[PDB]
Every structure is written in C-alpha cells, then in structure tokens.
C-alpha cells in the first residue's frame, strides 16, 4: 500500500548544478530522483548528506591568567641609600618599586633624622593572592572541514571535504570553497571554567607592554611569571614632623576584576565536542554563526543504464508508536526497514499519513533488517502515521491520543490548506 | 624544553638517482604538529615542497614533482623522513623539515645541502 | 597558474642607524589576516618574525610590529640594531597554494 509522498523528479536534460550555505550547527540532507530524458519509467536515486562544521584552529598556548590584590607600602631610612637595604616586597611575586634616593630635604622628614639629603625614602607596590581564574589561548591558524556522503543509484562514496579537497566521483562533484567565519587568526579565546562552558574572544590581548587592568596584564606562563607594570605615579605626601607616607594615584583593580565588571562588552562563544592537544583545539560551534560556502555538480552523462541494474529494493513496517498528535508534544515512531540486494544503501524514512509527513530520519542501512526511529510533530485524531520510503509504505499504521539542528529538503510537494487545522 | 631540529642525508647524487632525507626533532610533542618540508636555492626565495599530517594518512605534495618525493614520519623516534626519486638538476637546493602550523612554520632547522650533478 | 602573487619590493635604500623603518608586502588577492613574516639573517636559516599579520613570534624583540590593509600590508621596526639587518619575506596562507615572497634586504648605514 503506496502513497503520493514521493521525492522531487528531476529530469536530466541538463547538468544539475546547486550552491549551499550551510550554518555552522547544522546538518543538510538533500535528496531527489533523477529522471532519465528518454525514459519517464527510468529514475535513479540521488542523496547528499553533509554533517556539521568541525573547526581545527592551531593555537598558541598562552597559558593561565591570574587575579591579585593591589597593595603598597612604604620605608623609609635616615642614612645611606635606597640601594643598600632589603624590602619586603622585592620578594613578592609581582613587584615595581620607585625609591626617592638622596631626596631626604626637612619638610618630609619625622621628628628624628635632623638630616638633609642623606636619608631614603622606598614605596614598593606589590600583589599578593595570585589565583588563576582562566586559560588563554591565541589563533594561529584556522581550518574548516565537512564530512559528505553522496548516494547515486547503486554507487555510495564518502569522504571528509576540507577547503583544499573535493569529493570528486564519475558523475558527482562536491567542492568547499567558502567559509564565512566569526572566529579570525591573532583572536585570544579565554576558558573562565571548562571547556564546555564557552569563554570569550579578546582582540587587544596585550603581549609587550602589558599594564596592571588590561586583558592578560598577569599570566602564569609555563617559562614563568610575567608580571606587567603599572598605570600612574608615585608621589610623596608628608607633613611637618611626620615619617612621609608614599601615596599612588593610579589603577587599583586588576584585569580580571575590570574584565568582571564590563563582561557584557565582550564577544562570547559557546563549544560542542572539544577536542584539545598540544597544538590544537578542534570543537563545533553550536551558536550557528558559520556558514560554509558548498557547489555541488552532477553531470547528465549518468548512464542510466549501468545505475540500474539490480536497484537497491527495500521494504518497511511500522511497528509502534508513543507519543501525541498535538502541536508541540510529539511522538516516535518505529519502523522496521529491510534492505535487499544491495549491501549498503543511504536513503532516508519519513513518518507520514493520508495527506503529510510529519517527520522523517536519515539512516544508511544495512543488507537486512534495519531499526530506524522517526520523530514527528503535528497530526489530528484519527490520523494513522506509517513509515514510508520514496513511494511505499507499510501495511497498517498506528494512532497517538491526545530544532534538533537537522534539514531535511526532499523536494516533496507539501499539503495545501487543506491540511490546516482539520 | 627547548625545540631543536637537526637534517641529515643529503650530500651529491647523480642526475637520475634516488636520495631519502631525514630529520631528527626533539624538545615538543612531535605526534601532535603538521610537518612540511621547504627547500631554498642558492641565493633565491623560499619554496614549500610537501607536508605531512600526524598519523600519516594524508599528504600534500607540490604539482611539480608528481609521485617524485614522498614524505613520512616515524613518532616513536620523532624523526621525518623524504624520500625522492630519480632527480634532476633543477632540484639543487637547502631543504629544512619544519613544523607546519596549517599555514606558517614557526621553527625551522639547519638545513642540508642536496647536490644533482654528474 | 592562478596562484596569489605576493609583490615584496626589493632593493631598500640604506637606513641610519636607532631610527624607524618599514617594510611593505603587496598581494594579488585579499588574504584578509593570514600572513606571515620571516627573516633569514646571512647564512642562517630562516626565523618565524611575525603570525597572524599582527602577532609576535615568541623569542622576537618588541621593536617589532606589523599591520595593513586589504592586499597592502607592512612590518615596522623602531630603534634599529645592527643586529637585524636582513632579508625578510612574506607569506600568506589564506588559500592554496601557501605562496611566499621576493624578498628585501636591509641595509644599516653608519
């Protein structure tokens, strides 16, 4: 028992040329039945199948950001010079000193030390609590690759179409020319917590003059630390008869904290499947913000007649159901589909009714039986959903009672609106 | 450590001879990186000659030299091989091994000197 | 061939020397940010100076910068040395072929 839910029949008069954009999280399956120009009765099927955008992006381990506490004391001394003691913070991780040296007038100095030009006066701003807060890298080099399978009456091939490649076979051709890209080389991706979660995208990720507040001013490079200077001055503020105090109008709060604090003016991303190495990091954007730039040629010297002996026969049944017929709860279908004389043989299942198909599910089946489930949304009461090949379908059907980054373009003339709200 | 690559095997060879080329690099993670081989004539501009992926399965060569040379590696002593076949006199040039980054190469060796004369 | 040609212009006048001087790299094509730069100093091998059109390579002093527009793109150096006094070349890898450059070799003049 067979319905009208066929494929688009093409006739191959000419060659058939087609151009696809295809969003970085998504998969395309365009499939048709390509129609002999001296035989109506003579149709031979032809499937696409290209998965999602894998990115390979050589990358330079910059190594670990880290977050401190902005702090500064102040020595002082009555004789000698500032060149001959030791301080606290010349000890610290991160540390700049300006030191005063001979400046020791009257008007600066405490209650002792009646001297003139002969004291020190040493301020040493330092950082302490160093934590790590996030992983930076920095884009060398990108590549986009796409892995397409094409199934032309008897014939299957596959292959992994990178930017310098194409799938080229007898009759088919599939090529990648394209990459419209929100990612570009010299780009710092930034991992606060795990992979999975994402980071950000800094461009003015600083390198030589890094200052106490820029994106990576303190970095925990494997080397060592590399700590960056300050943005201000020093100054020294005294009173009469007291030790002067060494005072710093500048930056207080570091890179991390302003980073913190303007999160929002910052490119974010989101990672699928990560894959890192010591010189890579392989991931699929889910974000759908990619799109690959496809040409796909079929010439119309197919020869019919080698591409149709011994066709690729199969069978199916639907064998249960679970779910609903509503707008928006959705039921699952089995389908018990048996593949014959043919060893392999991509195709794809859809879940329809007397009038539509609500659902449908690409699978490369096997010489034998074949469990495909089909996911659909939509139907009315009595609607009796079957599993169905091109033109065949099963036996019997069942009835129910009371997105997923797949695109599926078969060609098949859809219901009017004789199907709305019936 | 530090990153230090070494060629060896090349020298003076005849006009129609076979010659292999190896590279010894040590100091990174050398299952992990591209290699690419580029050759230098004397006194003239770079040219990339062939590239290789890290297990091996995929190889990319210049349309020059169809089937002439071949490249390959070996991870468990870190070492890059290129074989060539017979040669000809415009093939007289330095070669340095290379760790191909899928575009620039960020650190190159000391290169051999390949000699085709009778 | 329709291969990119990447016009690197030589024949440099000579500079004094701990002033500034810079080096321009044309393209065929628009690469847009895959380029490279490179110094290959008398008898030495080559050195990775320059990745990403706008990125220093590690062990490079920072007296070294780079940048550029569509198809026209320069490498800037402050306060010469006499040390780097070279040649330097220019690479893109946006598309196959990876082509390199000519080259233009420097020239301190005391």
């Known amino acids: 028992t067979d319905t009208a839910h066929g494929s688009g029949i093409i006739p191959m008069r000419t060659d058939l040329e087609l151009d696809f954009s295809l969003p970085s999280s998504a998969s395309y399956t365009y499939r048709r039945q390509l129609q002999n120009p001296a035989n109506e009765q003579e149709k031979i099927p032809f499937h696409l199948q290209i998965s999602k955008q894998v990115i390979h992006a050589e990358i330079q381990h910059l190594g670990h950001w880290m977050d401190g506490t902005f702090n500064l004391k102040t020595a002082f001394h009555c004789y000698g010079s500032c060149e001959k003691y030791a301080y606290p913070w010349q000890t610290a991780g991160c540390f700049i000193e300006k030191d005063y040296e001979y400046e020791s007038g009257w008007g600066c100095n405490p209650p002792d030390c009646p001297g003139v030009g002969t004291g020190c006066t040493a301020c040493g701003v330092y950082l302490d609590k160093l934590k790590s807060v996030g992983k930076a890298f920095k884009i060398v080099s990108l590549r986009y690759t796409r892995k397409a399978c094409i199934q032309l009456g008897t014939e299957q091939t596959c292959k992994s179409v990178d930017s310098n490649d194409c799938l080229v076979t007898t009759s088919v051709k599939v090529c990648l020319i394209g990459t419209v890209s929100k990612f570009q080389p010299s780009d710092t991706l930034l991992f606060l917590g795990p992979l999975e979660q994402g980071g950000l995208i800094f461009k003015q990720w600083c390198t030589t003059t890094c200052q106490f507040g820029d994106p990576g001013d303190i970095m925990s490079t494997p080397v060592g630390m590399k700590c960056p200077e300050l943005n201000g001055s020093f100054r020294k503020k005294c009173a009469f008869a007291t030790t002067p105090v060494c005072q710093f109008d500048g930056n207080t709060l570091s890179g991390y904290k302003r980073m913190i604090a303007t999160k929002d003016s910052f490119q974010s991303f989101n990672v699928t499947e990560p894959h890192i190495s010591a010189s890579s990091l392989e991931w699929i954007d889910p974000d759908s913000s990619l799109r690959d730039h496809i040409n796909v040629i079929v010439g119309r010297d197919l020869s019919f007649q080698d591409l149709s002996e011994t066709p690729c026969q199969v069978d199916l049944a639907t064998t249960s159901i679970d779910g609903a017929w509503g707008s928006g709860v959705g039921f699952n279908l089995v389908c018990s589909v048996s593949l014959t004389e043919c060893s392999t043989f991509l195709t794809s299942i859809k879940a329809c009714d007397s009038a539509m198909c609500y659902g449908s599910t690409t699978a490369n089946l096997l010489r034998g039986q074949n469990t495909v489930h089909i996911v659909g949304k939509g139907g009315h009461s009595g609607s009796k959903f079957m599993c169905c090949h091109d033109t065949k379908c099963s036996s019997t059907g069942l009835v129910a009672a009371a997105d997923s980054d797949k695109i599926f373009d078969d060609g098949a003339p859809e219901c009017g609106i004789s199907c709305w709200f019936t | 450590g530090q990153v230090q690559m070494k060629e060896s095997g090349g020298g003076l060879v005849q006009p129609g001879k076979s010659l292999k080329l190896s590279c010894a690099a040590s100091?990174?993670?050398?299952?992990?990186?591209?290699m690419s081989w580029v050759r230098q004539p004397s006194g003239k501009g770079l040219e990339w000659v062939a590239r290789?992926?890290?297990?091996?399965?995929?190889?990319h060569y210049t349309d020059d030299m169809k089937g002439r040379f071949t490249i390959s590696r070996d991870n468990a002593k870190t070492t890059l091989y290129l074989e060539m076949s017979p040669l000809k006199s415009e093939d007289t040039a330095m070669y340095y091994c290379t760790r191909d980054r899928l575009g620039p190469f960020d650190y190159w060796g000391q290169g051999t000197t390949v000699t085709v004369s009778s | 061939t329709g291969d990119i040609v990447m016009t690197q212009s030589p024949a440099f006048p000579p500079v004094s020397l701990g002033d500034t001087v810079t080096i321009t790299c044309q393209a065929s094509?628009?690469?847009?940010?895959?380029l490279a730069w490179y110094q290959q100093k008398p008898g030495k091998s080559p050195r990775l100076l320059i990745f990403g059109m706008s990125s220093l390579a590690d062990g490079v002093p920072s007296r070294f910068s780079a940048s550029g527009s569509d198809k026209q793109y320069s490498l800037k150096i402050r306060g010469l040395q006499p040390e780097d006094a070279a040649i330097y070349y220019c690479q893109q890898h946006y598309i196959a072929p990876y082509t390199f450059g000519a080259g233009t070799r420097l020239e301190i003049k005391r």
């Open positions: 100091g990174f993670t050398f299952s992990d990186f591209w």
């Open positions: 094509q628009s690469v847009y940010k895959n």
């Open positions: 290789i992926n890290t297990n091996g399965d995929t190889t």
